[PDB]
């Protein structure tokens, strides 16, 4: 875990303090705009449930993926920036995102 954004943020957000998580996606949009996706395009989740929603527009995201040499305690990530549609599973009241299903 070093200075690239992925190594830094994964550690800061308590994802890699006690393990190395293989992949994680960060969304660079306002919280309310991401929560707004729960009332957008309803789609089926990969698991078949129907509480998933796809964003009308693409969103700024950063994909973090472990390199093939990464090993606890020295997790290492490859950082990839992209703009894509996000698909989230929503639940509760208020109806908010609880899982990131995919990115298109």
């Amino acid at each position: 875990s070093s200075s690239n954004y992925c190594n830094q943020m994964m550690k800061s957000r308590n994802l890699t303090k006690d393990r190395c998580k293989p992949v994680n996606t960060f969304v660079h949009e306002s919280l309310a705009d991401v929560q707004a996706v729960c009332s957008q395009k309803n789609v089926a989740c990969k698991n078949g449930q129907t509480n998933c929603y796809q964003s009308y527009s693409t969103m700024s995201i950063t994909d973090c993926r472990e390199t093939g040499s990464s090993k606890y305690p020295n997790c290492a990530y490859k950082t990839t920036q992209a703009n894509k549609h996000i698909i989230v599973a929503c639940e509760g009241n208020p109806y908010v995102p609880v899982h990131f299903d995919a990115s298109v």
Partner: peptide
Amino acid sequence: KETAAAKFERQHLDS
């Protein structure tokens, strides 16, 4: 403790 919504935010949101 941490709710599922809170966890989603800590793990995926970077406004």
